[PDB]
Amino acid sequence: EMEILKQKYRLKDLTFLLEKQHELIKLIIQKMEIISET
Amino acid sequence: KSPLHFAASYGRINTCQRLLQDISDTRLLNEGDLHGMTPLHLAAKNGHDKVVQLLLKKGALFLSDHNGWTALHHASMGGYTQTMKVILDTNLKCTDRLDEDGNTALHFAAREGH
């Protein structure tokens, strides 16, 4: 039980990190110098 | 044209401010994609609020694409609450519209579980 519980918390931390990273990448597109391939 | 679809589809606020300074030009925003999607729906789908509010201040007229989906519908898939609040405060007549089969904005919000 405690091992699956630990896995659940680790996966929650992982998905929080991935959500933040995805928001960050969206930040990356929303200000880009797309001129050569515009 | 296509660059407008691209830029409005990914939250390029400065470019939008640049290339829609022509007030008399109206038909280009009301254009359609291969699926008829209007930039509003694109920005609602791709997580962007400043661009959709900027277009709304122009009077986007709330176009509807194929499959009957509308801006609120596409904004629902993704759980972006900010676009919901900035698109609902303007008019309450944009919640009960219906798509090709009968699903509403609530149907899709529940479907994606936000």
PDB file of N, CA, C and O in Angstrom, chain B residues 56 62 72 87-95 97:
ATOM      1  N   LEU B  56     -12.125  40.124 -30.023  1.00  0.00           N
ATOM      2  CA  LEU B  56     -13.479  40.388 -29.551  1.00  0.00           C
ATOM      3  C   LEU B  56     -13.749  41.882 -29.461  1.00  0.00           C
ATOM      4  O   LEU B  56     -14.860  42.338 -29.757  1.00  0.00           O
ATOM      5  N   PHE B  62     -18.934  36.314 -33.383  1.00  0.00           N
ATOM      6  CA  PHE B  62     -19.163  34.948 -32.905  1.00  0.00           C
ATOM      7  C   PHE B  62     -19.562  34.012 -34.047  1.00  0.00           C
ATOM      8  O   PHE B  62     -20.663  33.462 -34.084  1.00  0.00           O
ATOM      9  N   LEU B  72     -16.618  29.261 -27.433  1.00  0.00           N
ATOM     10  CA  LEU B  72     -16.688  28.713 -26.083  1.00  0.00           C
ATOM     11  C   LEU B  72     -16.484  27.208 -26.092  1.00  0.00           C
ATOM     12  O   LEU B  72     -15.843  26.653 -25.194  1.00  0.00           O
ATOM     13  N   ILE B  87     -14.862  35.629 -22.352  1.00  0.00           N
ATOM     14  CA  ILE B  87     -15.818  35.477 -23.438  1.00  0.00           C
ATOM     15  C   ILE B  87     -17.256  35.418 -22.943  1.00  0.00           C
ATOM     16  O   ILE B  87     -18.182  35.586 -23.750  1.00  0.00           O
ATOM     17  N   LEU B  88     -17.475  35.175 -21.650  1.00  0.00           N
ATOM     18  CA  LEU B  88     -18.832  35.115 -21.123  1.00  0.00           C
ATOM     19  C   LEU B  88     -19.329  36.463 -20.627  1.00  0.00           C
ATOM     20  O   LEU B  88     -20.535  36.731 -20.692  1.00  0.00           O
ATOM     21  N   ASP B  89     -18.432  37.321 -20.138  1.00  0.00           N
ATOM     22  CA  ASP B  89     -18.860  38.603 -19.588  1.00  0.00           C
ATOM     23  C   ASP B  89     -19.422  39.528 -20.661  1.00  0.00           C
ATOM     24  O   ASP B  89     -20.173  40.456 -20.341  1.00  0.00           O
ATOM     25  N   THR B  90     -19.072  39.304 -21.930  1.00  0.00           N
ATOM     26  CA  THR B  90     -19.585  40.173 -22.986  1.00  0.00           C
ATOM     27  C   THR B  90     -21.043  39.871 -23.301  1.00  0.00           C
ATOM     28  O   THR B  90     -21.835  40.792 -23.530  1.00  0.00           O
ATOM     29  N   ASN B  91     -21.418  38.594 -23.319  1.00  0.00           N
ATOM     30  CA  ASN B  91     -22.776  38.215 -23.681  1.00  0.00           C
ATOM     31  C   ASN B  91     -23.109  36.853 -23.087  1.00  0.00           C
ATOM     32  O   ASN B  91     -22.279  35.940 -23.102  1.00  0.00           O
ATOM     33  N   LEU B  92     -24.325  36.733 -22.561  1.00  0.00           N
ATOM     34  CA  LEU B  92     -24.838  35.476 -22.033  1.00  0.00           C
ATOM     35  C   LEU B  92     -25.601  34.670 -23.077  1.00  0.00           C
ATOM     36  O   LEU B  92     -26.045  33.556 -22.777  1.00  0.00           O
ATOM     37  N   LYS B  93     -25.760  35.196 -24.286  1.00  0.00           N
ATOM     38  CA  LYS B  93     -26.457  34.499 -25.355  1.00  0.00           C
ATOM     39  C   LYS B  93     -25.562  33.516 -26.094  1.00  0.00           C
ATOM     40  O   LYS B  93     -26.003  32.916 -27.080  1.00  0.00           O
ATOM     41  N   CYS B  94     -24.322  33.339 -25.644  1.00  0.00           N
ATOM     42  CA  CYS B  94     -23.360  32.457 -26.288  1.00  0.00           C
ATOM     43  C   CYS B  94     -23.108  31.178 -25.499  1.00  0.00           C
ATOM     44  O   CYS B  94     -22.059  30.555 -25.674  1.00  0.00           O
ATOM     45  N   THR B  95     -24.033  30.781 -24.628  1.00  0.00           N
ATOM     46  CA  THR B  95     -23.867  29.556 -23.861  1.00  0.00           C
ATOM     47  C   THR B  95     -24.791  28.434 -24.305  1.00  0.00           C
ATOM     48  O   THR B  95     -24.417  27.263 -24.182  1.00  0.00           O
ATOM     49  N   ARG B  97     -26.027  27.946 -27.444  1.00  0.00           N
ATOM     50  CA  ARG B  97     -25.934  27.542 -28.836  1.00  0.00           C
ATOM     51  C   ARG B  97     -25.611  26.056 -28.922  1.00  0.00           C
ATOM     52  O   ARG B  97     -25.196  25.426 -27.947  1.00  0.00           O
TER      53      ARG B  97
END
